[PDB]
């Protein structure tokens, strides 16, 4: 099942969409400069692009490290991004009351992994009618995603994207099960599946190999963070990186699926 | 480090404290029936007791499934449990705004495991000054608990309990690392550590073996949800009394 | 099901048996010296004791680490240990052809974890008729142990001990599932289950807590690869294990 | 580091090599039939090829279960494969004494995953001087592989292939950590790393997606079994390999990018 996001077609058999951006919105000018670089590189390579940032990063290393600009100023900045670049945007919500104001501005609203079973939030998100990105908790299996999906459907919203971010593998370590992509496709009605490579690892050097492995399984999109300069990609390496992802994606998508 | 909760002393070298009650509050009458039963059994066995219940089911099977009595009704029921029996109570909080009102009534406020790293909730809970029970996320190592403890300390609250509830072990399964109790005691200043045997399990046949194994490591309390409770606690008390009767090697 | 090992009764409802000694046999004199210490401490506490050592260790940390005195001298040392102390002994075997001669002297023969599925060794071990200690691989679930038990039963030997050593938990880390003990008892006909506490340890400092946790689940024995427990803390350690085991074993199963 | 296996160059920046065959040797006629299919398909696809089979299944669930033709019959069958097709072959060895006899005939000898820590088998295999395939145990980390490599090096053999086959994930389940390939290359001197997709899997349907994911990380080879649950149906080999070759060719055509 495909989802239309303005003029973008998101689907497991369409050219991959980059959900790309930064961790926390904490500025106007710098946000715009980083977005500008994403837009320039993705336009150059012809890759559909959705800008990502959180306005409230609620799980930070220290309690007084900056949470971000917050909802009201964050939405102002997202409005500027859309008016300048003409692209869709994505951001996460944390409480039901945020869902309406965020959804009026942002094309995709995201359910944080740690809140993915919070029924009140799921219902409030569903009722916006907005496209939703569901972050898969590291402690949840791929077959258990249908249960979150069912809840969204019961509440009247089937415009859902499932986002892989790795699975707990012993202490303080994540593994990405490449077989989980297929399980999610087969058990949740072939909804768009995307891959958060940034939150799947702890080391920067391995991002390309891990991203290519995931995209080899035939996915709707790649979800990453960069920094203007730990796992975030150096922004200057974006073009070299995306050249490789596009190469593989273009190959994989050009062939029809082979049933075993 | 010991924590005083009314007349109860909670600490890793004190007689274990039982935390128990219901999953979700359904009514005042059934709440008082269950709590009276725990009080009766724990009293005759001589085990300190803190009544546990949540006023809200945050995760529910259907979007239309029953959701508990909610904050206002829930706090009313707790107020009366405290009146009737004169025991401390414990409940979980999910939103920062809930903390101060819930903290007025409930002696211990609990940080859900799913929300353990949510900075806003940590600060709001700390600010109440109440005793706090920190559920260890299944995806978090014992040595990383010190970072959550550090946050509560920066926010000015050191009346902290650490609560084991198992660790992710492949898909859809939990294992309890019995070595994690000692690592938490060693790295988090010997704060009270308790064991949620119920949410560590899958099936109930194994609750006794698991509870005994955990309490053999020398813990402040046990957290759970024929007279099976009685039979169970007789055995836990025997082991706890033995373990705590020996000097720490 | 209980297993008689000379004058010892080994079983999940009997006083726990200690299995311990040295890693590899080198000399009669040094073996007797270490064994004598275990015997004295265990006799002082009234704990049954089976002396353990390898005569030919096949899974050494380095290729040129000493393998042990070998089969011939190793069995002579075992004979002397049995004659001097009047206790049973246990050793590992990794070659089918070794099983018969080793079983002539050693009361319990042990199947290394890494050979646990090797049919030829299982068959040769079973055919000795001796008591066998099955070391559970860290990658094998407790419900899969019944298949190993089945292969021994097919080969005509039911005198089996199941030895827990922890399970793989991500990378370079082991966890002991305390629920696995009960699963092995229920699925494997209540064969004696013993706990190799040393294998999964991060640090020697944690041995006591981990040993006590496992023994709380009601087990036939405790197995030491003694990180290693310092032999001078052995008495104080065993005082605590016996305290717990005596308490648990004295109460009838629920 | 590359490894020459007769005319084949095996290495992490070379065209992938297929290590392909069957579970166990059952008879000569069946073995030649299957091998002939592998050879015909790989030759026309231009994929280097090494035939795989075990001569003994040492760990079956029943002591009565069928175990294969055995060592003596097995080696004879391997000789006929090498004569008929002129390709290298690979088989596993479970006991030290079998190593030199097996290595006379079999170009690559394989250390079984279960026996990784069997020090006498390591030494016996190393002494043969043959190319060695090390099956990565499900219970060993990619950074623990250096320890086995070290032993082989101490024993005087550096022609080692590292073969991923998944990692233990809870009970009775495997997960392949796609980051482990990189860790092995970086910590074990860039020895050839290959991927056993077959023993990594519980379910047949997923073999192509998993194989593609692994090969996307830039590998020396793919290791797989066919049948005429997890083994690939033999008739699908050509279509399967068309896809694997397409990806490998793409990945290998772009320079390595550091991050
Ligand atoms: Cl995110
Ligand atoms: Cl998560
Ligand atoms: Cl959790
Ligand atoms: Cl093992
Ligand atoms: Cl041993
Ligand atoms: Cl194989
Ligand atoms: Cl393995
Ligand atoms: Na919108």
Which structural class fits the helix and strand makeup of chain A?
alpha/beta
Strand order across the biggest sheet of chain A? 3-4-5-6-7-8-11-12
Number of domain modules of chain A = 1
User: Which series of helices and strands of chain A comes N to C?
Assistant: EEEHEHEHEHEHEEEHEHEEH
Report, as a whole number of angstroms, the end-to-end distance of chain A. Answer: 22 Å
Beta-strand content bin of chain A: 15-25%
Oligomer: homotetramer
Q: Which pair of protein chains has the largest interface, and what are the residue counts?
A: A-D, 39 and 38 residues
State the name of the first-level CATH class of chain A.
Answer: Alpha Beta
Number of strands of chain A: 13
What would the CATH topology of chain A be?
TIM Barrel
If you compute it from the alpha carbons, what radius of gyration of chain A comes out, rounded to the nearest whole angstrom?
A: 17 Å
Bound molecules: chloride ion, sodium ion
The largest sheet of chain A is: 8 strands, parallel, barrel
Family (chain D): Belongs to the KdsA family.
Main location (chain D): cytoplasm
Subcellular location (chain D): Cytoplasm
Organism (chain D): Neisseria meningitidis serogroup B (strain ATCC BAA-335 / MC58)
